[PDB]
Design an enzyme around this catalytic site. Structure first.
Site, PDB file in Angstrom:
ATOM      1  N   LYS C 115       9.481   5.293  12.908  1.00  0.00           N
ATOM      2  CA  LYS C 115       9.402   5.439  11.460  1.00  0.00           C
ATOM      3  C   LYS C 115       8.440   6.576  11.111  1.00  0.00           C
ATOM      4  O   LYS C 115       7.337   6.651  11.657  1.00  0.00           O
ATOM      5  CB  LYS C 115       8.932   4.125  10.827  1.00  0.00           C
ATOM      6  N   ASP C 204       9.767  -8.944  -2.756  1.00  0.00           N
ATOM      7  CA  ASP C 204      11.084  -8.326  -2.910  1.00  0.00           C
ATOM      8  C   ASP C 204      12.017  -8.727  -1.758  1.00  0.00           C
ATOM      9  O   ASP C 204      12.589  -7.875  -1.061  1.00  0.00           O
ATOM     10  CB  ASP C 204      10.944  -6.798  -3.037  1.00  0.00           C
TER      11      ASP C 204
END
Lengths: 77, 218, 325
Positions: C115, C204
């Site tokens: 990442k 979320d």
RNA sequence: AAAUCCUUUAACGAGGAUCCAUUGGAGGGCAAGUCUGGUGCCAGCAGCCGCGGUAAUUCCAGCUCCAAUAGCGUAUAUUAAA
RNA sequence: CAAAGUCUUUGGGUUCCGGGGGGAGUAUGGUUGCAAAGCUGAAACUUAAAGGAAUUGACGGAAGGGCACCACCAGGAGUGGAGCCUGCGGCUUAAUUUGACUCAACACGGGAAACCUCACCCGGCCCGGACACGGACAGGAUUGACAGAUUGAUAGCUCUUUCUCGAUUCCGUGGGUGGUGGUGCAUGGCCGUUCUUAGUUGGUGGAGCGAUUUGUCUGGUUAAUUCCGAUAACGAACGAGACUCUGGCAUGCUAACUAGUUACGCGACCGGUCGGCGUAACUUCUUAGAGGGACAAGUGGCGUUCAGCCACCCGAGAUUGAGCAAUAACAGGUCUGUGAUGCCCUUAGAUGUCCGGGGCUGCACGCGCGCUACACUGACUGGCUCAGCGUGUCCUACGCCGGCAGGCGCGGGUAACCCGUUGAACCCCAUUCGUGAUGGGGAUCGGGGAUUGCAAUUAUUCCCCAUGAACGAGGAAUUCCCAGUAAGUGCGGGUCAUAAGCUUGCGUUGAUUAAGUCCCUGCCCUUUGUACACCGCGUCGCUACUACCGA
């Protein structure tokens, strides 16, 4: 630079260089004739020449005789 | 074509003032370039002493503009020195020349030994002090030539001085201060009182006060 | 790619030293903090501008160089190469909005996921905000993997880079059918209670943050948004995530729930919301440190005179002026 | 002294491939090239300032020009510049 | 600084003391000191500088200021989620050419490529190598070639076959043309951005040794170096402003058979209606020319009564919308638009060129621009009716024939005439279904049919049956916008042999909300300060070489 296909595949890990100073190395071979895609650091001039360096160790010939003929008096041509 | 603006200028235009000396006698300021260019005419040559390029700090960044040092001189009389800064170099030069014509001063020329022939040297040892540059002119005997650094050599040559022992002190390398010092020294030659000017000065009417009736018409 | 493997490390790290303190870093400072080679680093900078490694800035008075988006990225991979985690590049790249996913391969040939944070205020602050993001994400990734959670395995962190376990699948948003909807549903419902047990709420927890591995195993990624259960609205974020999953399986797969979990368990697990006397040898060390610092300070001042660009600009105009006279 | 050399003198002795002038330099200081090729922060130059990392006015060459001139560079002691 | 003055016009007496920075106020010696230390006090060596005053303000992580719907607030419409159209990456491929990568790449390269374009890939062709000189060559250098083999090719390209072609050459030396070949980081030009944001620059005078400053400003005011006004400044030039186009209004003017109206006569049918027909009155409608018109003018509020702002009457209008756009710059894009170009490469088994074939369109994927949607304010079905910018030798009417794509024949239009009174779609009035994956939505596919063009298999497009899917208003995040404005809705041009889910314009229906602020992403002013300092990377291992100490 090559003429077979697996000629290029043999010298794959050989790093290319260039007359105008670019430092590259081969990617894919394409043709059945010696054609190759090659990556470089920058963009090549068309006026350019690509070239790879190959090396072997060489040792001298065993030609030793202690006898050497007597020369005639030296003169100029 | 010249059309004068000042009173002095108008007088000059005609034939009311005969020489440049009548201006210097009454210490009037010459505000127009043409007056000098009229009296001395073709006798005024010039030397560009230096073109130093400077980059001016602007909010637009940096742009190039040139500083010109020009020493105008009619030989055997009058020097002047001008400094201008401009976009072009030719512009800088012409501006400096114009500016140097406005600054024309007379020099008093003296004698070394016995006063035989024409004057050749600085009348008495004078000095010109300009911002850490100290220029000293010294009377030299006839035919010695100007024994100086190149810049006051130029300036003294164009003043019409034939021979002078120079000596400079301080940071003579900065050209502006050097040239300006030497000009300041040479101006001071008339400002120095000797025994020569001991007679009480009888006062002639000023160019203005004499030709007053002619200035009514203009 | 990475061909150059010597001077490029030292020069680029020297930019990162100046980036933490100031905006655009002058070329005068670089050579002083990269004292190993003197003078010939200015031609390295000219090779760095060929790539997207550094950017030039000559505004009004500010003269020097700043680090780029891609230039900051190469520095992490150069460090990960020395830690023997990254060697070659895998090509499957999921270009996102907050980060980029690059497949990497080690010495073994074992493929891992990398990442790279791409937060996009000047670029100096943007390449500092990505620094704090990776350190925070790696912190949760270590915290959950140790506590039995089905998350990617943390390997190494370098400035903005995070190396994780390669879990390859499809995100839940682009899934047509699941062979066993009920078992997958109960797996997901357990994971909300699991986090609440450890004193965490996802916030979320949607279909946009869940990946299925062969339609058997639910994988959770992306952790900078997480909140404590000490929060006043703790049960609201808990119930919103429940209803999001309840309706989704009813919408996409037409599975209605028999089990309605609304248990508040704080905390039965680890609270992860927090997440002659002097010997001659010493005299030698101390005298050495004094003598190195005296030489290093003098070398800085030698390198600060490199200005070479200021002298080049002044010479060009003088040639023009003399010719015109 | 005897010679030599100079001076004095018979004969021979000058057309440029000769009876051929050198040493330093040519960015600034500092008089003289943004000429051409080679080199590519390398080799090197450079008293100092600086030049070289692919158009090098500063390197090595070619051509061209400038200063001194049967001399001209370089190191050092020293005087003026101080 | 009234001494730091009476200094190159240098000398009143006199004591101490500095001579680039470091090393270093360190060593060593001496001396004073109970000690800590003090006084005195080097060199070797290293370095082009250490520094002092002043001056603009690139940058503030300064503080303030002000600015903008490409910022927010108050809002409307979305994107992002589905299906598809196309661009980018990524990956397979002979090749799936290439440039572009935050705004300032990604329906961009007028990039909607069947061939062509075409650079890419495969196989072949041609010479389109000008010229100078040498070789050959007229007892022909060379050119063209049926048949048959080969060949995709009636490709004399190669071979057999043996006919023509009359110097028009051919072989080489050089070495010229040509490249969508390389370099946009070698150039021009054009363009993009910073910036649609608002200044830039002299001249003369004044101040300072000079860099510089004043002009260019206290304050109010403005988008603003704008204005009032204050004043060591006074005047300018350049651009914005002043303008160009367009739109708004004129019962005033110049006019019309290639737009008309009014009227009359004739006609038709129930005093009417007729875009049905022809003469006369004329410009209101229509075209398009000049000239008007609106300038914060009138009145009242508020404002250092000052530039202006606010409110309203008369008014068509009391903001119409764009174009053009500065000083400087990015090493922004672009040799792929140039017969504009520099070098370098490739030049005849070519990177020149034509030919046939493919590819640029490929598919697990992410990212984007955009259309159709997710229905009841809806769709289908009739009937009703209303524009404008335009384009036309390819637009097209009118008769017939085929449901429909379309065919047949005759006409008009090189154009205010014909299409065309341009009888456009949402919209309006009735019928149908009725909350459901439904008749909403139509993807994905099977069959036929018709055109375009040398060729439609990688469906070019268009029609008619089937098939009939995801899709239930979409998180994190973000985009656009203030009045005929968002959004709905068609139309026309460009692209085009065939073609618009793109784009550039045109109308038509038509709003809610705000007329403000510096919070947000940024941008712009103003005021003020300014030319990477110090304290917190190492351990061991064998060999030689250097310089110290030393039995």
């Amino acid at each position: 630079m090559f003429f077979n296909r697996e000629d290029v595949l043999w010298f794959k890990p050989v790093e290319l260089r260039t007359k105008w100073g670019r430092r590259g190395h081969i990617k894919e071979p394409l043709g059945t004739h010696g054609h190759m895609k090659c990556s470089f650091d920058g963009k090549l001039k068309s006026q350019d020449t690509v070239l790879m360096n190959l090396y072997k160790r060489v040792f001298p010939k065993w030609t030793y005789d202690p006898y050497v003929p007597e020369p005639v008096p030296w003169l100029k041509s | 074509e010249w059309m004068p603006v000042t009173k002095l200028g108008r007088l000059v235009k005609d034939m009311k003032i005969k020489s440049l000396e009548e201006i210097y006698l009454f210490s009037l300021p010459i505000k127009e370039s043409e007056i000098i260019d009229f009296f001395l005419g073709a006798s005024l040559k010039d030397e560009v002493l230096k073109i130093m390029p400077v980059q001016k700090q602007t909010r637009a960044g940096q742009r190039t503009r040139f500083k010109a040092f020009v020493a105008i001189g009619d030989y055997n009389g009058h020097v002047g020195l001008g400094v201008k800064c401009s976009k072009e170099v030719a512009t800088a030069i012409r501006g400096a020349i114009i500016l140097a014509k406005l600054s024309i001063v007379p020099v008093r020329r003296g004698y070394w030994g016995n006063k035989i022939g024409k004057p050749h040297t600085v009348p008495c040892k004078v000095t010109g002090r300009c911002g850490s540059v100290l220029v000293r002119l010294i009377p030299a005997p006839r035919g010695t030539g100007i024994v100086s650094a190149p810049v006051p050599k130029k300036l003294l040559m164009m003043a019409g001085i034939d021979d002078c022992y120079t000596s400079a002190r301080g940071c003579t390398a900065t050209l502006g201060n050097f040239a300006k010092a030497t000009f300041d020294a040479i101006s001071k030659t008339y400002s120095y009182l000797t025994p020569d000017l001991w007679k009480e000065t009888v006062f002639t009417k000023s160019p203005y006060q004499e030709f007053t009736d002619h200035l009514v018409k203009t | 790619l990475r061909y150059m493997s010597r001077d490029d490390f030292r020069v680029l790290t020297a930019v990162e030293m100046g980036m933490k303190n100031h905006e655009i870093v002058p070329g005068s400072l670089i050579a002083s903090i990269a004292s190993l080679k003197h003078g010939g680093c200015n031609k390295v900078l000219r090779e760095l501008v060929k790539h997207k490694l550094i950017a030039w800035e000559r505004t009004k008075t500010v003269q020097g160089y700043r680090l780029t988006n891609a230039g900051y990225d190469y520095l992490a991979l150069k460090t990960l190469s020395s830690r023997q985690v990254v060697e070659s590049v895998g090509n499957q790249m999921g270009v996102g909005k907050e980060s980029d996913i690059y497949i990497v391969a080690n010495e073994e040939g074992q493929q891992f996921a990398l990442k790279l944070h791409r937060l996009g205020r000047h670029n100096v602050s943007w390449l500092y905000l990505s620094r704090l993001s990776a350190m925070k994400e790696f912190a949760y990734m270590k915290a959950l993997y140790e506590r039995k959670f089905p998350v990617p395995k943390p390997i190494d962190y370098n400035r903005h880079a995070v190396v994780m376990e390669l879990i390859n699948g499809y995100p839940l948003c682009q899934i047509h059918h699941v062979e066993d909807p009920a078992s997958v549903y109960d797996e997901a419902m357990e994971l909300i209670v699991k986090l609440a047990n450890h004193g965490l709420i996802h916030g979320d927890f949607n279909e946009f943050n869940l990946i299925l591995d062969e339609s058997d195993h639910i994988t959770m990624i992306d952790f900078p948004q997480m909140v404590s259960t000490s929060h006043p609205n703790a049960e609201w974020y808990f119930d919103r995530d429940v209803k999001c999953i309840k309706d989704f399986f009813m919408k996409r797969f037409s599975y209605e729930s028999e089990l309605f979990p609304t248990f508040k368990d704080i905390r039965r697990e680890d609270t992860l919301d927090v997440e002659s006397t002097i010997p001659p040898e010493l005299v030698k060390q101390k005298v050495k440190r004094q003598l190195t610092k005296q030489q290093k300070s003098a070398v800085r001042r030698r390198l600060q005179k490199g200005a070479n660009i200021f002298t080049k600009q002044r010479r060009e105009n003088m040639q023009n002026i003399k010719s015109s006279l």
